[PDB]
Design a protein around this ligand. Structure first.
Ligand SMILES: CC(=O)N[C@H]1[C@H](O[C@@H]2[C@@H](OC[C@H]3O[C@H](O)[C@@H](O)[C@@H](O[C@H]4O[C@H](CO)[C@@H](O)[C@H](O)[C@@H]4O)[C@@H]3O)O[C@H](CO)[C@@H](O)[C@@H]2O)O[C@H](CO)[C@@H](O)[C@@H]1O
Ligand SMILES: O=c1ccn([C@@H]2O[C@H](COP(=O)(O)OP(=O)(O)O)[C@@H](O)[C@H]2O)c(=O)[nH]1
Length: 502
């Protein structure tokens, strides 16, 4: 019953051959196999990985079911979306290497069969698959609720997750209203502290034409109305493309869709990877940076959200994007990432001229390496418990309380102290007695069911405490009062984990 690290992919390869729909994912795993095996052994030398119970794990890929009508496997090789497939590939690989008993499903039959057999201890699924899970199992689906880890790339804010509160605000999201512990949502980037950061691994194969730029956007429509911007870059640089077509100027050198090996070799010799503004928060820019390319990161002033961007309407968040790649912007920055308004011609020109004159190294944040990802997911599996069975994680010792000023969210105030909001600690900040510990003195108080509390008015020393524990929210600014915010430290380059969380 104890987990043994796997260093051989033969069983994973047989598992991935059962469905055609896993083909793209199988090629990625085979290209990164050596780096994966190097990282599980390396992690095992740094950390006792013994004494872990082997878990029976459901991995249900809703996006690859017919019934979903997503047809994501059918566009994998022709410029279709791959970020979800990137993340699913790396999640499956990590579970496999860490020695767990994985049962993969891309169908209602396998979902039913695997659950039928019992002993499932852990469930990875997407929101489309979660609807299927509830429908296939019936009312006893809720018995398995605390085991769900829900891969939700853009994240779910608590106001969208609480079904009744969401209705009361007129949130029509088809993605929300699941009433989970919002830490059960697993995001693509660490942009939503209400959720967990799952991420993925940035592919790279290193052991450069200074003039060569490569445009981000493997679909022609993404290039709509970028002619002036591309012209600026073309004044200094060749402009290449990987596009599967009358938006793409005449001077653009289109290589077509490249297989990962060949795309990775084009990144190796490219000086500048160029963002057009779409798509949002994908892997491709981190691949460019891992290959020593600068990334030109379109800045959004004002920031993009459901308030002003059609793509975001219906998504279970009000999160504002400051750039095409806010993670690249804030967690990498210069010299690797240049965040520029495509409007300000000077800004764009100076960025290109500087990029030409820079000498930069390949860079990967630790959390996006094989070993980083294995450490993050191993800590989640061993320590993250919503089934009340284990000791408190993260541990109470990690709690740092900060007061958010009016118009500042808990996300922002934790971040401004190089901490991260830790929603599992809201429970320790929610009554008169507890606030004394954190030098807030409540002259009066009341309860409220609001995402903005616990709140404190320092003028009349009045405390509002949370009436509905499902509405605890790192997201959200009080326009008038201070918020009492739970923060935590993180391991350097590993924001998912507190220093005492391993
Ligand atoms: C897989 C998944 O659920 N990903 C996240 C999701 O992202 C959305 C999802 O869209 C799935 C497909 O949904 C419909 O079938 C279409 O909108 C597809 O787009 C294609 O066809 C459209 C017309 O039918 C066309 O408008 C469009 O240009 C495209 O060619 C979608 O593929 O996944 C895609 C791809 O990344 C994404 O763009 C969608 O936003 O959002 C969820 C909520 O944020 C999140 O939980 C989930 O991880
Ligand atoms: O010609 C190409 C261009 C991109 N990619 C891959 O497409 C993946 C997804 O990158 P992107 O940021 O475009 O995410 P998406 O929008 O596809 O989810 C990355 O791993 C790239 O390596 C590819 O295989 N061939």
């Amino acid at each position: 019953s104890l987990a043994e690290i796997r260093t051989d992919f033969n069983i994973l390869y047989s598992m991935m051959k059962k469905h055609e729909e896993f083909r793209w994912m199988r090629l990625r795993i085979r290209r990164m196999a050596d780096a994966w095996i190097q990282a599980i052994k390396s992690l095992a030398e740094k950390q006792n990985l013994e004494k872990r119970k082997r878990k029976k794990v459901l991995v249900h890929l809703g996006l690859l079911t017919k019934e979903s009508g997503f047809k994501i496997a059918e566009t994998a090789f022709s410029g279709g979306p791959l970020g979800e497939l990137v993340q699913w590939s790396d999640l499956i690989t990590s579970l496999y290497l860490l020695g767990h008993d994985i049962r993969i499903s891309a169908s209602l039959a396998e979902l039913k069969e695997i659950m039928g057999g019992g002993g499932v201890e852990l469930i990875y699924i997407d929101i489309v698959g979660l609807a299927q899970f509830k429908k296939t199992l019936g009312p006893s689906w809720v018995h398995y609720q605390c085991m769900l880890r829900v891969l939700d790339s853009f994240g779910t804010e608590p106001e969208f997750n609480h079904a009744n509160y969401a209705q009361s605000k007129g949130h029509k999201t088809p993605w929300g209203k699941w009433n989970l512990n919002p830490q059960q949502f697993y995001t693509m980037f660490p942009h939503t502290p209400d959720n967990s950061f799952l991420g993925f691994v940035v592919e790279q194969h290193l052991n450069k034409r200074q003039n060569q730029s490569l445009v981000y956007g493997k679909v022609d429509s993404f290039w709509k109305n970028k002619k002036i911007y591309l012209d600026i870059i073309h004044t200094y640089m060749e402009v290449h493309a990987t596009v599967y077509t009358k938006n793409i100027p005449s001077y653009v050198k289109n290589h077509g869709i490249l297989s990962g090996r060949d795309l990775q070799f084009l990144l190796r010799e490219t000086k500048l990877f160029v963002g057009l503004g779409f798509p949002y928060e994908g892997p491709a820019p981190l691949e460019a940076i891992a290959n020593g390319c600068a990334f030109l990161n379109p800045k959004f002033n004002p920031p993009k959200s459901s308030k002003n961007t059609d793509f975001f309407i219906g998504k279970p968040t009000l999160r504002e994007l400051t750039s095409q790649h806010p993670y690249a912007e804030v967690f990498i920055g210069r010299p690797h990432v240049w965040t520029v308004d495509l409007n300000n011609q000077e800004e764009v020109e100076d960025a290109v001229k500087a990029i030409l004159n820079q000498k930069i190294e390949p860079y990967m944040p630790y959390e996006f390496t094989c070993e980083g990802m294995l450490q993050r997911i191993n800590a989640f599996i061993e320590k993250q418990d919503f089934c009340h069975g284990q000791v408190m994680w993260p541990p109470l010792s990690a709690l740092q309380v900060k007061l958010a000023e009016p118009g500042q969210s808990c996300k922002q105030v934790c971040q401004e102290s190089q901490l991260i909001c830790e929603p599992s600690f809201f429970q320790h900040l929610n009554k008169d007695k507890d606030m004394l510990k954190y030098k807030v003195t409540c002259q009066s108080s009341e309860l409220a069911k609001d995402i903005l509390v616990p709140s404190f008015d320092p003028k009349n020393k009045h405390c509002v405490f949370q009436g509905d524990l499902l509405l605890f929210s790192c997201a959200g600014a009080h326009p008038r009062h201070q918020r009492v915010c739970p923060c935590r430290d993180f391991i350097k380059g590993q924001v998912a984990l507190c220093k005492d969380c391993l």
